[PDB]
Design a protein around this ligand. Structure first.
Ligand SMILES: OC[C@H]1O[C@H](O[C@H]2[C@H](O)[C@@H](O)[C@H](O)O[C@@H]2CO)[C@H](O)[C@@H](O)[C@@H]1O
Ligand SMILES: OC[C@H]1O[C@H](O[C@H]2[C@H](O)[C@@H](O)[C@H](O)O[C@@H]2CO)[C@H](O)[C@@H](O)[C@@H]1O
Ligand SMILES: OC[C@H]1O[C@H](O[C@H]2[C@H](O)[C@@H](O)[C@H](O)O[C@@H]2CO)[C@H](O)[C@@H](O)[C@@H]1O
Ligand SMILES: OC[C@H]1O[C@H](O[C@H]2[C@H](O)[C@@H](O)[C@H](O)O[C@@H]2CO)[C@H](O)[C@@H](O)[C@@H]1O
Lengths: 407, 407, 407, 407
C-alpha cells in the first residue's frame, strides 16, 4: 500500500482543517487525523457525534430563543436575519452530518483516484495541494475571525458609548448588563448567569465558524479537484511539440475520465452543502447590500458593516471562482489537444477532445446550476436586479434615519 | 402476443389511477382497465364521454356563477383566483379530452416500445414501475385530500367562529346558511336547495381532483419514461469493466433510439397538458406566495394557507423533478459510455455518445421550454423576481390588515 | 430553363401579396408579377419607386403633424404611441426599400435553390407553398382589416355618442367635424379640406397595412423556407426502414446545405426587417398590455381594444412560430437520421447529423437573437417582467378613471 | 527577419494611436514607435512611466477633490457620477499599466502569429488593417472631441446665460469666476490660480481621453484579431468549388489554431480592461438613460446631453460589435467548410469543423461573459430592465423640475 505519510494527497491537505471543524463539531468522523484515509469511518456512537449532538442542541436552544424573542417583539425583515443565521447553522450541521456519512467512501475513492497523479509523468506544481489548502483556509479563517472580532467590538463600543454619553439613566457599563442587553433574546428565555453568558458567547463563535466553514470546505474540495485537473493540463501541455503515441493519449484520457468520475461522486456527496451555502450566501449578501445606504451611529459601526459586506461578497466570489477553476482547468487542455499533429491524431484524442468540449466538468448545486464563471456572472446580475427591486421596499426605513441615542 | 396480465408495463402501472380520474370524468377512454392496451379506444359515444360532458357542463355552470358573482361585486386580483381555478379546470377537461383522443396510439406505441425492456439483459429495479407509480400517486392523492380537507375545515371553522363570537346578529349556524354564505357565488344565480348544495360540494371536489390530476398524470408519465431510461442506464453500467462486442452496443443504441422516439411521441401528445399545468402552477404559486405576509384570523386559517402553499410548491417541484429525471437518466449513461475501452470502442459507441451528449431527452412544453433541473432553477428565480416586483402591488392590501370580525 | 408558370415556387406563391404591398408602395420592385423571377429588378427610376416616394412623403407629413401636435400639447407616454406608429411605418418603408434593393439577388438564388425540390424524390405536400402562403396572408390581411375597421368604428361611435348624449354644446355630428376632432393633429398644421380628409384616411389605412405587412412578409418568407426544410424532412422519413446508399445521403446533405445557404442569404437580407418588426411588436404589445386594466367608456371601445391586443399578440406569436418552424423542421430530420442502420451509416450521415445537431437553422435579428420557440418563450417572459414593473408607472393613471363625457 | 516597415501588421496599424495615448500617459511602453515590435519593452524607469506617474498623481488629486467636495455637500446618486468618472479613469491607468507590462510579450506573439497571413494564399482585403484601425480610431477620437467640446460649451453657456439674465447679483462673467464655480470641487481644496485652472482643464481633457481610449483600444485589438480571422475565412471561401488536398486543410487548421491561441493570449492580457470598460459603460449608459426625461434649461444643454448619451450608447455598441465580429468571422468559415465535397472530406476538415462549431472564439471579460452579438442583446435587455426598475427611484427628482435661474 502507498505511504500516505508523505504523499501529496487531498486527505493529508485537508484533515487539519477538518479536525479544526470537528473541534466545533461540524463533520463528526472518527480517525480523521489518520494518515491512512481507509481508517476514516463514520460512527453515530463516537465522541465527534456526541460533540455534534451537544452543539446542535445548543444551536437549537439559541434558535428557539431568537424565535420566541422575535415573536414577542414581532418579526421584521431586519430581525429575521438573526433567525436565518441560526437556521442556516443548524441546517449546516445536519448537512455536514450527512456529508460525514458519505465522507469515508468519498475519501477512499478520492485517494485511489489521485494515486496515479503522485507519480510521473505528473509533477507536483510550485504550490502543492497542502500549501494551496493551507493558504486559502488560513485566509478564510483569519478573515472570519476579523469579521467576528469587528462584530463584537462594534456591539461593545455601541453599548458602552450609548451608556457613557447617554446623559440620562446610567446603568453603569458591565459585562452582565451588556450580556442581558445585546443578547436579550437569549436571557429572556433562560435565567441569566455569567457561565451561561460565556457559553452563549462561545456557541455564537462556533455558529459563526460553521457559517464560514461551509464555504471554506467547498473551497478546499474545489482546490483538491482542480489540483488534479491542473496536473492533467500540465501533462498535456508537456506534449505540446512532440509526436505522441496512442498509449500516452489512452492514459491521459483514462486519467481524465477517472478525475471526472471523482468529480461526479464528490458533487453528488456535496450537492446539499453547495446548495445550502449558495442560498445562504445569496440571502446574506442581498440583506447586507440592502443596508449599504443605511446610516450607522459610530465609525466602528460603519467599519464592521463594510468589512462584513466586503468579506461576505469576497467569500462568495472566491468560493464560486475556486469551484469554477475546476471547469476552467478541464477546458484548458482543449487548446493544447487542438494542436495535436495530423500524424499523432487518433481516435483517443478525438474521444478526449469530444469529452472535454461537450461535458460540463464542474461542481453543481444538485444539478440545478453548475459552479462556473458564467454562473458567478449571472449571480451578480441577479443580485443587482434583486437589490434594485428591493431598495424600494426599505426606502421608508432608510429615510427613518438614526434613532436618538438616549432613546 | 405477450401476456400483459403480469408484465411490468406502464399501462398496467397507471390504469388504476387513469380509471380513478375517469370516475371524475377526466380522460374519457373506453376499456382503460383492459389488460391488453390494444383494447383501449376513444369513443365520443361512450359512458366516459357522457360523464365528461356532464362534468364539463357542471364546471361551466360553476365558472359562469363565479363570473357573474365577480361582475356583480367587481373583479379584484384576489377574487380572480377563483375564476382562474374553474377556468383551468375547464381547460384541463378539454386538454384531457384531446389527450384521450391521442392516448390509444400513444399507449400502443408505448407498449410495443417497452416489451424489449421486460426481458434480459434488462432487469426490473428494486422498485418496479407499478410500485413507483403507486407510491407517487398515493402521495399526491393523499396530499390533495389533506389540502381540500384543510380548506373545508378552515372555511367551516371561520364561518362558525364568526357566528358564535359575533356578539351581534346571530343567524344560528347551519349547513344551509354556510352553503349560502361561502358559496354565495353559486346560489346568487341558482335557487338554493340542499341537493344542489351537495352537488356543488361534490363538483368542487371533482374540480380540485382534476386540478391535482394534471400534475399527477404528468408525474406518472415521467415515471414511466424515466423507468425505461434507468433500465438502459443500468444495462450500460453492467458493461462497466467488460470488453463489449459491437452487437451489444448496436442493441443498446437501438433501444435508446426507440426510447427517445417514444419520448418524442409522448411529448407531442402531452405538450398541451404540460403547458397548462406549468402556467397554472406558476400562477397559483405566485398568488399564494403574494399572501404569505397577509394576516389571517384563526390558526386554522394559517394552517390551511401554509399547507396549501407548501403542497403546491412541492407538487410543482416534484412534477418538474420527475420530468427532469428523464433527462438526468438519459445523461447518466454518458459517464459509463466514456469508460469504454479503446478495444471495445466502435462507431456504434460514438453514435450513441453523440446522441446522448447533444440531444435533449426531456419532456417539453410545446418545445417552448424543456423540463430539466435547469428549468426548475430558472422557474424558481423567475418566481422570486415576480414576487419581489409584485409585493409592492399588494403592500396597501397587506397594511389594510384583518377586517373586524363583526363586520 | 424551367417552366416557372406552373412550378410550385416561392416567387409564384408570394408575388400576389408582394404586388398588393406594392399597391401601397411598400417594396418598390419592377416586374414582380413576372413568372420568371430573373425578370425581377430594382430601379430607382420606376413607377413603384415613385409611388414609394409619394407614400413616404405623405407618411413624413403625418409624422411631422403628430410631432408638432404633441409638442403643442406636450408629449406623454400615452400620446407617444402615435408618433411611434408613424415612425415605425416610415422606418418600414426605408427598410423595405433596402429589402427591395436586395430582393432580385435573393429571389434569384431562392429560385435556383428550390428547383431540385420540385422534382423527385421530393413530393409536394398536401398544402402546397402557394396554398400555405395564401391561407396565412389572407388570415393576416382579414384580421388587420377587422382591426382597422374596429378602430374606425370605435372612434366614430365615441365621437357621435359623446355629441349626442352631451346634453351641452352640440356641434351637430358631421364628417368634417369628426375629421377635425379625431385627426386634429393633422389639420392643426394643414388647412382643412374634405379632399385632404379622404387623403388622410387613405394614407392612415396604407400606414396600417405597412405596419401589418412587415409581419406578414416575415411570415411568408418563413413559410417559403420551412416548406423546403419540411420537404427534406419528408424525404429523409421515406428512408425510415430502408438500407440507403451513400449517394442518397450525399444528395440529401447537399440539398440541406443549399437550403441552409439560402436561409443564411435570406436572413442577411431580412435581418433589418426582422429587427424592426420585433422591436415594434414588443413595444406595441407592452403598451397595449399596460392598458388592459384601464376603463373605457363604451362596449365598442372595449371590443376594439381587446381585438387589437389579441390580434397583436397573436400576430407576434404567429410570426415567431412560423419563423421557428424553420428551426423545428431542420431538427425534425435528426430523429430519423439517428435511426440509420449500422450498415447504412457512413461519413455522409455523420456529417449531416453533426450539421443538423450543432447548427442553428433559423432566421435571426442581425444575429442578436434567433427566431426559435425558446426565443418566443423568453420574449413572453420578458414581456411579463416589463408589464409587472411598468404597471406601477401607470397606477395613478389607472386610478384617474374615465373622464366626464361632457368635458 | 521580416521587413516590418511596410508589412500590413497590427503593430504598425495601432502604434500611432498607442503613442497618442502615451501622450496622455495611458500605456507606458518604451519604443512603441519602433518598426520592429521586438524593440517594444516595458520599463518602470522610463519617460512614459514618469508621465504616467504624473498623470496618476493629478487624477488622484482630482479624485480626492471630488470626494472631499461631495462629503462637504453630501453624496447623491447624481453627484456620485463625477467620482465614478475619476475612479474609472484612475482604474484605467492602473489597468493600462498592467496591460503595458504584458504588451511586449503579446505584441511579439501577435507579430509572429500574423506573419503567415502576410503572404499567399492570403490576400490583403480592400480595407487593410491600418486603414480599418485609422478609420475606427479617428471616428472615436472625433466623436469624443465633439462630446467634450459640447460639454464645455454647455457648461460655459449655462454659466454665462445665468449670470447675464440673472437680473440680480451680477458677478460679471470671467474665466476665473467660471473656473471657481463649475470646478469648485477642486478649488475648495487647492488655492485658486490661473495656472492651476489651465492645468485642471488639461487634466480633465486627459481623463476624458483615457475614458474613451479604454473602448478605443478594445476596438483596435478586436479589429486586429477579426482581420486575420476574416483572412482565414476568405482563404476558405476560395476553396468553394475545388477539390482540396489534405495539406491545404492542414495549413488552414494550423493557422486557425494559431489565431485562436493568439486570441486566448490577448484575451488573458486584456480581460481586466474589457471588464473595466464594460462595467463603466454599463454604469454611465444607465445613469444617462435615467436622465432622458429630466428637464434642462437651455437647448445647448439638451444638445450636449443627447449627444453624450447617443455617443456613449454607440461607443458601447460599436465596441461590443467589433469584439463580436471576431466570433462572427470565426463562425463564417463553417458554412464554406460544410460545402466540402465527399472526395475532399478528411480528418482535418472534420477537426477544423468541430473546433469552429464547439469553440467560442471571442474576447471575454475574464471568462465571466464573452463579447458576442448575443451578449450585446442581453446587455440591452438588462439595461432596459434596470432603467424600468430605476425610473421609479428618480420619479420624485423628475417631478422636481428645473430650479429657478436666479437661485
Ligand atoms: O449577519 C452576519 C453576522 O452573523 C453572526 O452574528 C449573529 C450573532 O452572533 C447573534 O448573536 C445574533 O443573534 O444574530 C447575528 C446574525 O444575525 C456573526 O457572529 C457575525 O460575525 C456576522 O457578522
Ligand atoms: O386556491 C386553491 C384552492 O382551489 C380550490 O378552492 C376553490 C373552491 O373549491 C371554490 O369553491 C372557490 O370558488 O374557488 C377556490 C379556488 O379559488 C380547492 O378546493 C382548494 O382545495 C384549493 O386550496
Ligand atoms: O395602436 C395601434 C393602431 O395603430 C393605427 O392607429 C393610428 C391611427 O391610424 C392614427 O390616426 C393615430 O395617429 O395613431 C394611431 C396609432 O397610434 C391603426 O390605424 C390602428 O388600426 C391600430 O389599432
Ligand atoms: O459624464 C460624462 C462626462 O465625463 C467627463 O465630465 C466630467 C468632468 O470633466 C468633470 O469636471 C466632472 O467632475 O465630472 C464629469 C463626469 O462626471 C467628460 O469631461 C465629459 O465629456 C463627459 O460628458
Amino acid at each position: 500500500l502507498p505511504n500516505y505519510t508523505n504523499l501529496d494527497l487531498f486527505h493529508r491537505a485537508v484533515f487539519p482543517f477538518m479536525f479544526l471543524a470537528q473541534c466545533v463539531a461540524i463533520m463528526p468522523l472518527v480517525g480523521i487525523r489518520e494518515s491512512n484515509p481507509r481508517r476514516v469511518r463514520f460512527a453515530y456512537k463516537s465522541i465527534p457525534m456526541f460533540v455534534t449532538l451537544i452543539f446542535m442542541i445548543a444551536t437549537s436552544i439559541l434558535f428557539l430563543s431568537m424565535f420566541t424573542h422575535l415573536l414577542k417583539i414581532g418579526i421584521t425583515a431586519k430581525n429575521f436575519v438573526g433567525l436565518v443565521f441560526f437556521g442556516c447553522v443548524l441546517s449546516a450541521y445536519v448537512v455536514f452530518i450527512r456529508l460525514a456519512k458519505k465522507w469515508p467512501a468519498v475519501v477512499r475513492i478520492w485517494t485511489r483516484t489521485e494515486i496515479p497523479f503522485t507519480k510521473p509523468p505528473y509533477e507536483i506544481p510550485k504550490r502543492n495541494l497542502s500549501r494551496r489548502v493551507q493558504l486559502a483556509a488560513l485566509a478564510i479563517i483569519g478573515l472570519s475571525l476579523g469579521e467576528h472580532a469587528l462584530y463584537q467590538v462594534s456591539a461593545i463600543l455601541s453599548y458602552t458609548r450609548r451608556i457613557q454619553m447617554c446623559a440620562n439613566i446610567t446603568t453603569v457599563p458591565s459585562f452582565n448588563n451588556y450580556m442581558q442587553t445585546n443578547y436579550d433574546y437569549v436571557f429572556q428565555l433562560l435565567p441569566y448567569s455569567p457561565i451561561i453568558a460565556v457559553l452563549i458567547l462561545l456557541i455564537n463563535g462556533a455558529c459563526t465558524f460553521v457559517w464560514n466553514y461551509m464555504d471554506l470546505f467547498i473551497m478546499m474540495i474545489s482546490k483538491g479537484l482542480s489540483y488534479r485537473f491542473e496536473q492533467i493540463t500540465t501533462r498535456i501541455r508537456k506534449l505540446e511539440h512532440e509526436e505522441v503515441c496512442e498509449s500516452v493519449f489512452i492514459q491521459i484520457r483514462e486519467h481524465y475520465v477517472k478525475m471526472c468520475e471523482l468529480l461526479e461522486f464528490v458533487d453528488s456527496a456535496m450537492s446539499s452543502l453547495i446548495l445550502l451555502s449558495c442560498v445562504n450566501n445569496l440571502y446574506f449578501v442581498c440583506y447586507q447590500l440592502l443596508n449599504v445606504f443605511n446610516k450607522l451611529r459610530w465609525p466602528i459601526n460603519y467599519i464592521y458593516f463594510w468589512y462584513s459586506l466586503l468579506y461576505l461578497i469576497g467569500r462568495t466570489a472566491f468560493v464560486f471562482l475556486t469551484a469554477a477553476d475546476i471547469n476552467e482547468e478541464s477546458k484548458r487542455g482543449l487548446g493544447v489537444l487542438r494542436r495535436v499533429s495530423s500524424r499523432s491524431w487518433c481516435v483517443e484524442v478525438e474521444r478526449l477532445i469530444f469529452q472535454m468540449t461537450t461535458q460540463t466538468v464542474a461542481l453543481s448545486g444538485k444539478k440545478f446550476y453548475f459552479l462556473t464563471r458564467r454562473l458567478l456572472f449571472g449571480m451578480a446580475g441577479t443580485i443587482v436586479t434583486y437589490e434594485l427591486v428591493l431598495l424600494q421596499f426599505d426606502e421608508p426605513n432608510r429615510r427613518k434615519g438614526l434613532q436618538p441615542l438616549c432613546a
